[PDB]
Design a protein around this ligand. Structure first.
Ligand SMILES: *[C@@H]1O[C@H](CO)[C@@H](O)[C@H](O)[C@H]1NC(C)=O
Ligand SMILES: *[C@@H]1O[C@H](CO)[C@@H](O)[C@H](O)[C@H]1NC(C)=O
Ligand SMILES: *[C@@H]1O[C@H](CO)[C@@H](O)[C@H](O)[C@H]1NC(C)=O
Lengths: 476, 21, 245, 98, 274, 75, 472
């Protein structure tokens, strides 16, 4: 026999793959790319004013942030409809935008008494233990009174420099430009962004009723304690009113079928986890099954948790004069996409378990399997020198090059040098003598001396496997 | 939330030398 | 040298008055412009310099460089660099005496041996790393006390400390790189993984020789362009693994 | 093995013991070069725009209300070599120094 | 959508020109412009070389008739197992492509008398989109035909012993190359789907599936950008890049080298021995 | 080789430069490759299109140009 | 014994290579390639006028060409002073440019009977048997005189699209802008050229007083009878005033020493030919010596031709109102490149001869005998596929890509794709289908098959040679 079981095991896998492919096709349309592109180009490409040539991406001073927040920002937000405000006469700006900042207090750090006679105040790096909570300025409204993270219904962000909190001093802008401009001018007249600020957030959302699909926007400007301006942005095309069309019902049915399939697989895996064999971890085709099941279970858990709580949208729809809070939904959508992509990638990789239909594929699979052990053995030795080079580059160049700034960047730039992409002219001025020595020795050693070992091992293993297979056939 | 690398390096070296030994 | 005044309006007045005299306009080999940028938030200093070169009377060449460092004086006590830069001297002395105890033990003709030379490069590197850090600490302390002596009128040019703090960091990274290479070499003790290192050992001589032969014949990419090294590596690895089995 | 491990621990303490200000130094130097308009300061090639340069972007920086705490007045230097030279023939410069 | 088009003559150099300017307004707002320009020459009667090219075309038709009659009289000999040669299933491609080219050319030149009667510039818009469309297909068909006829020189060139050895090396390993290319493309499509799901809406280099495939091919060529991949996803982006680079440049690529190398060695050894 | 002249590419590039590279108007820089709004499209319609069509490049129009529109319905 | 023949010869070859390198060290500047590239790139930057900006590639229609002709078409060389006309005081108004144009005659064939009244100006391709000397226009001056090229101190054309003979007419500029502008304006009033011109060549000679070296610029234009014109331009650093200081004497002494060494080698070979094995070619290694002898003979002939041209050119500069005739010694840069290649080949031969001292670091790199040809079978089958792809790309693209405009540079574009420089910004919209297909099927068949087999072909050779060495 040995063929009736494999046929069922293959047809069920093909059905599951078809269902997953339909499901992943249904979630990735073509309008979202252009939607995001128009939003980004409207908000991140237009200059601050007609004379200045700096956009949001090239902010370089705290004065430039004030110049941007009145001008390009207000031009993008409020459009004179031929009251409400449609972004492109298509995208509706629902609610009102909100701006908030995080600041620290004076005397946070300690200047040495040797030079205390000239330095009066200091402000350390951002930290939860050393953030200001006292009122300042004219002291009327929420822009000058500290508000707890719990009352703001926010969460952390994990910015480039650090992980900011959700608290701070916030202010809800108006619904029309004539009042938002006045509010921003009032915030600028009194000193609201002094040396003590560390971050500033601007966020809003749009609907674009033509295609039922939201879009949340967040703009973050970071002020490090060492000076400078670090901008950031994020656009997320959410979708919260899913069940409108027939295709949406079809997608829901496909999701239910996928849940049934994953239940059947977990049942049939827990069935054979002990019956056919106990403690079978030497196959690598069953260690993949548990990964598939775990990833899919996590995906369904995230999906069922995210869509179960949409009370924010309803409570906004009761009264549309307040700021909608859609941060958590966007975060969970990003997490769900990240999980689903990996899940489908492993599902596609799983296909290798069945392509053994003839001698040509069987011998190739045998060659690939037999050469895994020594390749793994040599990979450790290769990566030891690779990480030694990475740490050398990080220590020597990791402060004046902008490309070796952190360890991950050193790893990635060495991988790119393996591809022969990165030029060497930006290292000699960083360091005159050790720069080109590093580049030359690294390319000399890793480029062919330690790189063709993989090819040699693979070639020798394949040749000897083929020779043995041919020899045993003739011996029989 | 500041991290001190001294104790981490010391413990890592001790654990590695124990494993090899 | 000029002090560029002390006040904002004084700076402008000095600039105009001294600029109407044309003191650096005709020959002016170089000018230079350097200043310090201490930052209290992170406890770091910064030596900033702006060089401007006039090679030919007319066209001027300009460049700049900013070296940040952490000013730590030797007299601060028993700081971590001081503690870690004196036991490194002890390790260097131990290695030197251990190699001298072998030199005379074996007699002479201990040349043309990598083990007899790789153990002296390590000693030299450790000694240099130990001494450069002490030099940096001493220079930093001297510059700081000189500055505090004449704070409202002196400049003290902290650039030397920035130079030494980079040289020491380079040496300390090179030593760690060598140690990591040695750790990689120590991986041969596995029975099935001892083939790689010794195949490389038998393959390097002729490989370097033929690379030199090709470079003499010519910096175009011939070797790694498509493949040659895999050819030799495959043959040597196959033969050696056949002998091993 | 014990001696090798101890030496590795010593060199790790020497190297990465203070490896927490490494990022801050990078951010500081990036902040300093961008503020001084490094790309603008390198763009100048004549000996007359230097003065408007350091008269509108350097003086407000070094001298200001708060203006990035300094710790020391800046200096200006010169060298003239007393063997004054003559203009070279036109075209590309003699990039070997004379 | 908005279409703007017209026709151009340029009496100086006898080359017509039909244009088409397209501006698209997506439902999300914005403008997407596009264009296409296509010169045309439909005189072909200017000098003594007109009859030269006519004679060339008619003798080409005679050659095609000879080839098709030769193939059909060969069909009078063994019918099946005729396709397992790669030099007989290609000659039918040659004749069918050339016949399609001849038919499309005669169809295109059949409707030309309407083109001449607009130099008076009457008050009527000419519909010239069919002629432009049929000038694009003909060029592609001719290019493919000339490519294949250039390729078909190997069946004549392999009578040299070294050329024969290379041809034997190629023929004896094609099955292994196809078998391994199946696995290679399965892995390639898995990675492409991963990238499309992750970087679908931000990079403009992974806007669609085919664009993802072309971007991965350029990555293999060594044309990574990596400036937008890292910022599009701080995590799982660099992971994708590093894993793709490792698996491709370290493992998958060398299998082709191993197959070709040992196949060539085995083939030459067997040939010399025999 | 006979059916491939050299004038076609030069003529196509010249037409592209005439109709796609010239600015819409002497006051802004938005050529046809960088349309961003309906107003810019209108400005092009009275702008560079008319200049390149009825030129004082020395080509002559035959027939008459036509403009067409596609649209959808409300709701 | 058995060691002098492998040591003395190697030492002599190394000494000859060192002498050649020393001679070539002060022969040409290190930026010769960059200078040539800059000269070739900036040879098509002629504006039209103050009204229109129709450049060379933007002036093909009526008014565009009219604007291009009327303007600074002849004002590039002559510039107003701050007479004389020096752009940068390096090339003063010392001489005038020359223009040569070759034409043919129509009516050299019979029109078809059907088109007897339709085809009248039916002219075939220009050839040697289609030469005419019929002048047209009113005879008012000496600019419409008929003359040959042999008696006018000239040569042939050697064009791209048409290699016409020396027949035609010649035109010379002036030594000042005041007369040149008036002459150009007078000529532009009426017609100046016909449609029967086959080849056109503009030759300009410049003194370039900044650095003592003759400069020649050539611009070629050829119009065939099948339609289309192939334009080209190039520059050559002619060597005719190289006698400046003792460096010229040193170069002459080096050339004399090289000639004497070549003569001695030829004498030794002759003495080792008639009294030894002669008329033998079954060695497959002596071909290198034959090629070395041929290269030395070619270098000697090039030096002799240069000396003859210099001697002939010594009769110029008689008056201070003529131009320097440099149309006979324009093979100096090519000769210098050939000399450098010969020196490199001599160094390679010396290294190959002296590498025998290596125990095993050079024995594995000597596989030419085992690989006698053994490799052209791959080069031919690679170039066939390369040309097939080049043809396919030049046909399917070539109208809306701005890159694949002509074959010779389509080859370069595919080469750059192989090297790693990929654009892929114009292929995709030029043709959405069959555009990406071309790129994918090209990269797959180049980077996975052919470039991967050319490694195996030399791998197996190395393994075979190593097996022979081990068994021996
Ligand atoms: C913060 O406190 C210090 C310590 O007295 C003081 O010098 C400084 O002026 C204070 N900052 C502000 C903004 O008042
Ligand atoms: C704060 O409140 C006072 C009291 O009503 C009011 O006059 C003032 O305009 C408000 N804003 C500021 C900046 O003082
Ligand atoms: C935060 O709490 C709830 C959200 O569930 C909401 O009713 C309240 O208005 C929120 N407050 C602000 C300032 O958004």
């Amino acid at each position: 026999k040995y063929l009736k079981s494999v046929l069922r095991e293959l047809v069920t896998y093909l059905l599951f793959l078809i269902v997953l492919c339909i499901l992943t096709y249904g979630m990735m349309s073509s309008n979202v790319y252009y939607y995001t592109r128009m939003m980004s180009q409207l908000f991140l490409d237009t200059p601050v004013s007609k004379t200045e040539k700096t956009n949001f991406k090239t902010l370089s001073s705290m004065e430039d942030f004030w110049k941007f927040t009145e001008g390009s920002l207000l031009d993008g937000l409020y459009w004179k409809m031929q009251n409400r405000s449609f972004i492109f006469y298509e995208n509706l700006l629902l609610g009102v935008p909100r701006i908030r900042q995080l600041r620290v207090r004076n005397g946070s750090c300690s200047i040495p008494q040797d030079l205390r006679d000239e330095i009066k105040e200091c402000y350390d790096v951002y930290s939860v233990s050393s953030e200001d909570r006292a009122p300042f300025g004219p002291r009327n409204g929420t822009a000058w009174i500290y508000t707890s993270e719990k009352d703001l219904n926010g969460s952390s962000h994990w910015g480039i420099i650090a992980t900011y909190s959700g608290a701070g001093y916030y202010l809800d802008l108006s619904r029309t430009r004539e009042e938002t401009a006045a509010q921003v001018a009032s915030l600028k007249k009194n000193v609201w962004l002094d040396r003590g600020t560390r971050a500033t957030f601007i966020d809003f959302s749009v609907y674009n009723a033509n295609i039922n699909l939201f879009c949340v926007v967040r703009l973050l400007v970071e002020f490090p304690a060492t000076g400078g301006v670090i901008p950031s942005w994020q656009f997320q095309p959410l979708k919260l009113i899913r069940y409108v069309t027939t295709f949406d019902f079809f997608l829901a049915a496909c999701e239910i079928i996928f849940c049934f399939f994953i239940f059947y697989y977990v049942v049939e895996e827990i069935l054979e986890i002990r019956i056919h064999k106990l403690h079978y971890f030497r196959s690598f085709w069953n260690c993949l099954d548990v990964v598939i099941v775990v990833l899919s279970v996590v995906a369904i858990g995230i999906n069922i948790y995210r869509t179960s709580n949409v009370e924010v949208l309803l409570q906004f729809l009761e009264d549309q004069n307040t700021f909608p809070n859609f941060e958590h939904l966007a975060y969970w959508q990003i997490q769900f996409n990240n999980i689903a992509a990996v899940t489908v990638f492993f599902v596609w990789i799983k296909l290798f378990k069945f392509i053994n239909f003839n001698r040509t594929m069987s011998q190739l699979s045998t060659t690939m399997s037999r050469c895994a052990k020594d390749l793994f053995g040599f990979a450790i030795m290769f990566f030891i020198i690779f990480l030694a080079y990475a740490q050398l580059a990080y220590l020597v160049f990791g402060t004046q090059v902008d490309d070796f700034s952190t360890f991950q960047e050193c790893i990635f730039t060495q991988f790119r040098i393996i591809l022969g992409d990165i030029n060497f002219a930006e290292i000699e001025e960083a360091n005159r003598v050790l720069g080109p020595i590093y580049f030359t020795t690294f390319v000399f050693f890793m480029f062919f001396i330690l790189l063709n070992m993989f090819a040699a091992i693979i070639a020798d293993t394949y040749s000897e496997v083929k020779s043995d297979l041919a020899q045993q056939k003739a011996e029989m | 939330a500041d991290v001190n690398y001294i104790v981490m390096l010391t413990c890592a070296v001790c654990l590695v030398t124990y494993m090899v030994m | 040298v000029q002090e560029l005044g002390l006040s904002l309006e004084e700076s402008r007045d000095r600039l105009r008055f001294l600029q109407l005299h044309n003191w650096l306009d005709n020959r002016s080999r170089a000018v230079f412009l350097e200043l310090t940028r201490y930052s209290p938030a992170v406890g770091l200093h910064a030596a900033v310099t702006l060089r401007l070169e006039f090679p030919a009377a007319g066209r001027a060449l300009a460049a700049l460089s900013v070296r940040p460092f952490a000013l730590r004086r030797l007299s601060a006590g028993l700081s971590l660099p001081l503690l870690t830069s004196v036991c490194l001297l002890l390790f260097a002395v131990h290695f030197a005496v251990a190699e001298a105890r072998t030199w005379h033990r074996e007699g002479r003709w201990r040349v043309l041996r990598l083990g007899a030379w790789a153990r002296w490069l390590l000693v030299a590197l450790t000694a240099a790393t130990a001494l450069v850090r002490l030099a940096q600490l001493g220079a930093a302390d001297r510059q700081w006390t000189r500055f505090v002596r004449g704070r409202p009128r002196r400049f003290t040019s902290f650039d030397q400390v920035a130079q030494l703090s980079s040289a020491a960091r380079g040496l300390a990274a090179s030593l760690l790189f060598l140690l990591l290479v040695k750790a990689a070499q120590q991986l041969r003790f596995v029975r099935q993984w001892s083939v790689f290192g010794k195949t490389l050992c038998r393959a390097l001589p002729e490989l370097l020789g033929v690379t030199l032969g090709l470079v003499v014949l010519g910096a175009l990419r011939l070797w790694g362009a498509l493949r040659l090294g895999a050819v030799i590596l495959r043959w040597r690895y196959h033969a050696l693994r056949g002998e091993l089995y | 093995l014990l001696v090798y491990m101890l030496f590795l621990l010593v060199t790790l303490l020497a190297s990465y013991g203070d490896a927490s200000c490494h990022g801050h130094a990078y951010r500081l130097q990036s902040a300093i070069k961008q503020e001084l308009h490094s790309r603008a300061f390198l763009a100048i090639t004549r000996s007359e725009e230097l003065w408007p340069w350091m008269a509108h972007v350097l003086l407000p920086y070094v001298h200001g209300n708060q203006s990035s705490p300094e710790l020391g007045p800046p200096r200006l230097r010169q060298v003239r070599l007393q063997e004054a030279l003559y203009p070279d023939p036109p075209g590309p410069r003699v990039h070997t120094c004379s």
